[PDB]
Design a protein around this ligand. Sequence first.
Ligand code: SF4
Ligand code: SF4
Ligand code: SF4
Ligand code: SF4
Ligand code: SF4
Ligand code: SF4
Ligand code: CL
Ligand code: CL
Ligand code: CL
Ligand code: CL
Ligand code: CL
Ligand code: CL
Ligand code: CL
Ligand code: CL
Ligand code: CL
Ligand code: CL
Ligand code: CL
Ligand code: CL
Ligand code: ZN
Ligand code: ZN
Lengths: 618, 621
Amino acid sequence: LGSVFSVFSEEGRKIAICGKVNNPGIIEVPEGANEIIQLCGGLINKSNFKAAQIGLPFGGFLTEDSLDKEFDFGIFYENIARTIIVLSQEDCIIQFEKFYIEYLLAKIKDGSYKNYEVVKEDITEMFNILNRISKGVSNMREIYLLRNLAVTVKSKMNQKHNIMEEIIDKFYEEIEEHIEEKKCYTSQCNHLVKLTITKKCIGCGACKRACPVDCINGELKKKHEIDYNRCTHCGACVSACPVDAISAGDNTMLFLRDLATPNKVVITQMAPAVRVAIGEAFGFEPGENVEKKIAAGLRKLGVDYVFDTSWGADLTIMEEAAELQERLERHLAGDESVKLPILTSCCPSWIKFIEQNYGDMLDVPSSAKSPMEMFAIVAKEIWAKEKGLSRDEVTSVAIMPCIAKKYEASRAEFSVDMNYDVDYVITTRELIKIFENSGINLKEIEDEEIDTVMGEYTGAGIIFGRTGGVIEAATRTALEKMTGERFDNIEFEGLRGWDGFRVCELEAGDIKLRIGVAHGLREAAKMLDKIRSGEEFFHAIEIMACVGGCIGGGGQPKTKGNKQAALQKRAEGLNNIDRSKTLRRSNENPEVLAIYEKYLDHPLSNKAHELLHTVYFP
Amino acid sequence: ALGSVFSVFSEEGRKIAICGKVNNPGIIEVPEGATLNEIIQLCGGLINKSNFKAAQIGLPFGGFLTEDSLDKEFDFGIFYENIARTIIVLSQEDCIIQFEKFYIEYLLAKIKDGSYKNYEVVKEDITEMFNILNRISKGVSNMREIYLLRNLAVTVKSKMNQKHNIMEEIIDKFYEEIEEHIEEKKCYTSQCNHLVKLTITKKCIGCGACKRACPVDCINGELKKKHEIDYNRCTHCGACVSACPVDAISAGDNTMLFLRDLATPNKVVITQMAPAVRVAIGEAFGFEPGENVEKKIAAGLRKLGVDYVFDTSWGADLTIMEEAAELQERLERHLAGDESVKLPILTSCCPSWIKFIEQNYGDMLDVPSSAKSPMEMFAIVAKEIWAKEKGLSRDEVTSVAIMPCIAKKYEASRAEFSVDMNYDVDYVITTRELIKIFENSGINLKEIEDEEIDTVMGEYTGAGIIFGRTGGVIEAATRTALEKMTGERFDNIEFEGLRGWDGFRVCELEAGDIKLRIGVAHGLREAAKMLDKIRSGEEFFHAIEIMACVGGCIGGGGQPKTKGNKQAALQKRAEGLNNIDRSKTLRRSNENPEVLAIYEKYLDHPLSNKAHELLHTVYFP
Ligand code: SF4
Ligand code: SF4
Ligand code: SF4
Ligand code: SF4
Ligand code: SF4
Ligand code: SF4
Ligand SMILES: [Cl-]
Ligand SMILES: [Cl-]
Ligand SMILES: [Cl-]
Ligand SMILES: [Cl-]
Ligand SMILES: [Cl-]
Ligand SMILES: [Cl-]
Ligand SMILES: [Cl-]
Ligand SMILES: [Cl-]
Ligand SMILES: [Cl-]
Ligand SMILES: [Cl-]
Ligand SMILES: [Cl-]
Ligand SMILES: [Cl-]
Ligand SMILES: [Zn+2]
Ligand SMILES: [Zn+2]
């Protein structure tokens, strides 16, 4: 178990400090009379002391009152447990107490402390209350409830200092803030964090210029703010700030805490484009596929199952190719109710982009969920059920190249009973930092395989990560099954290339399809304006918010050298992965076919709609 | 018990008990060669003329019939062993989600008491079904719910070795309705109270009466054209509903839900009732306006099946405990030179001022008290204290509020007054709706024997009871606050200045060294006059009361229509509340022993942290 911001995973007269102190470790503590942290190297950044837990399962809870005055050594309660989690002002009390309660509940559930069984349910309710607070679904009554629960527990455990009572006493203001203002001042509660420009804004106006939809108003050097109603979460502003004034959260600490929670099942998915960029932080060239290094590293961190978003992309193609074929058949049949083009793209940014500016084209996009959310729902409603786990007993973490995927995973449509299909997102950069600080070097770690049932993927799925790949995959499947012919050359070079707005004409048998591809939302605006004006007609379109597609996402490591060359290199790495696959059509993936044969029975069925489709623009 | 009809009536061989959406529920003698349609016709058809939707056979177990069985000889073999031979007929006016929630909950109760042991194995599964249905009725679902239900259905059908599980057929036959509920958040029959909004329906003729009645000018439309409500500015004052010559404006009706909950075995149902109900309901049963028939209401509610009868006036006493404290605090801070403080303080249980202030008086958001309404204070206490004391989780108690207006429906629907999808007030029934339930169920308040209200949350003072008429809220708060600020007990506790009937009233109360200027408005136009005068500085007030209805709550839109002169009847009801007040030994809220017990045992004193956590809310978040 370990914990620190900027990351670490730390795997008599001895203690174990793993809080917000720089340099986590065990250290041999001297017996001389505030600077104890200093002996551990101070706290991350220079954040002031908040508290220090003694013993992870249970001990004492120390607050500021012990800071500049004699820290009685022996007050480490006899059940010291030889570990200390030190808190700074950067740690949210709600999140920490959730982690504490879950650790205690796990050790109860495994028999380690049966003397606490009598209070098991009570503590569980505490967690539930805490969870509701972190999810923003609470009133102030929760405090009342917590207090009584605290009072109850301390009665049966006979304690003179009950942690929850003191938490209420000392951090009432933070809790009230969370509940009434729906605000977590440390931004650890990912479900209370919005993309926001903070006080470090200098009014340089870079974000205003960079925003493709002009989401930011504000003049001179006056603080700028994001008009969340039109924000596409494309993340251009975050990359453009001369400072760190724009924050969209960082779930690193949540990931570490979950990994350190005993008997908690943590599974991961990873976006197609991550595997060709992450290795750059460890000496690989752009485009080199290091997915097996990622798998081994994630397992070393403690991940119990490593899957792949490209599997979900194959499932997405099953649905989207089916819908494209249906729309084409209706169009050719003279049904004027149908709408063309059909948009196929896993990028959330088009949603807000279309609703606010192309409200005559709400019937264009496919109803299929993204590969990330398709994977997530299948993992919790089928795989976990298969393994006899309820959805809350599985923590599904998505490693993605984008902040927009954080926003998507936070959407309430992709959740049930306050359990989010994607529990949270970790970006490529954040994972790089986790690996770096935990001593995991992807260059030197031994390869490991991704887990099969939701990890196998075709080249159609993998090319999702670069511009033109989604529509290429969907077209592969749809044209091949509409013609009955297997293509000798399955690659559609017309859909490749790098122009911001690309037009392609694909001929297969009697079928002729006109395709539009845009990467960069301004080029997308050009293409959609052309569609509306009738200057051009399209059967299908792909829209990507980032130049180059997902390989150019804002959550990816900053490129080294020539930017365009590096992005093209990553895209061609995805294309080379595709060329190296035996299976290059999504409908060939045996595991996705198993999904259809055993649960959903065929694409566009009622069950398939219920699980794998959603309603954009409700 | 069992029973149902939309005019609502809990009706406590070759004989069947028909209790669906058929006119004339009852026990009927089936002719030999008879279809289902013939049985329905012998019961007089369905309420209104709605077409047949379905028919449940046997309350726990039987079959589920659709249109396909209507013109087909009713074979009695569907009445298998000990089915009790009952049929619940559904019309197109019944929501399938609500009915299946009732069915599943009934089956779960019959399992839970051991009479149906062989189904215990599916208990959890059936429970999950209910949860799914509940989530659908509350609008917190995705389409995945259907998937889940299907598998649960299959699971049950596997574990019971049954050839036809009802839920599978439900999905098959009403997929469109279920999908509507989930994706469109729409219950086309409007039985799901958490999906109903106040809307003008298609039966609107464009007469424009509602537009004229609206105090905030919230309704648009001309000539025969359908009128529309700008829901963003609507105060839910309910004037439009009262003005409509037709039934074009609908705000839901939880009557059937109330009946189903009453018919569910071993389900704890408790009620609170607003002060103004008891002086108006009796008008429907031969009493004069202003006559207090609260004990008749208690007996009638118990006859319907209510397990505990409490009183909103108790919550009004608790409200005064909090609000008098806040008023005293603000006065003391004002006298000390606190420019931090804001006056007046608004004390009123009426929801309508909230949006009214938010939409037009945004410089006065710090004016209203942070205290909840009496209804919601009762609700939080009932579920978080009373139910807890009796070893019941909040979902094991169904708390029903009997109120005179649709604005209380809107308040009970607010998400702030809920936790984990449990609403503190499960739903509201109006005085009119309860009148119709009594009338159709054979409960006559004139001839029924009196019964007492339950004690712990039913005892109340005259200060609490006068809440139901204009000027009463501020009168009660003033009683308590002035008495405790002066240390003097008043010889005459009535403040005649706060009484009267003018739309905008000004009063000056003198007690010891204290001098308070009070403004009272009933009718939101009068409220606007008074708040404009406050804003211009033309008048100054220490505290104000705002009521949306003329005369206060006794004049609510959910009350029975008055007979004779409207104003005279409303004044009669208000004076009935005043006479109840005069008949009470305790006439200050701070004397109520049960409210004081709340403070002594749980919250420790008004305006404490615990009291804020439970009895206060944030209007204008
Ligand atoms: S870029 Fe960063 S700093 Fe420059 S204005 Fe936008 S936010 Fe403020
Ligand atoms: S994210 Fe993309 S859209 Fe939202 S503000 Fe920053 S730039 Fe404009
Ligand atoms: S393109 Fe790929 S990366 Fe850029 S935003 Fe859309 S999804 Fe995130
Ligand atoms: S009153 Fe009823 S009918 Fe006349 S306009 Fe308003 S709604 Fe339409
Ligand atoms: S309720 Fe009151 S406010 Fe809302 S519309 Fe009808 S009248 Fe206007
Ligand atoms: S006054 Fe009483 S009745 Fe009229 S609306 Fe406000 S609360 Fe409902
Ligand atoms: Cl683990
Ligand atoms: Cl995705
Ligand atoms: Cl493999
Ligand atoms: Cl980048
Ligand atoms: Cl199947
Ligand atoms: Cl069943
Ligand atoms: Cl009952
Ligand atoms: Cl009330
Ligand atoms: Cl009690
Ligand atoms: Cl309503
Ligand atoms: Cl009594
Ligand atoms: Cl009336
Ligand atoms: Zn937090
Ligand atoms: Zn419904």
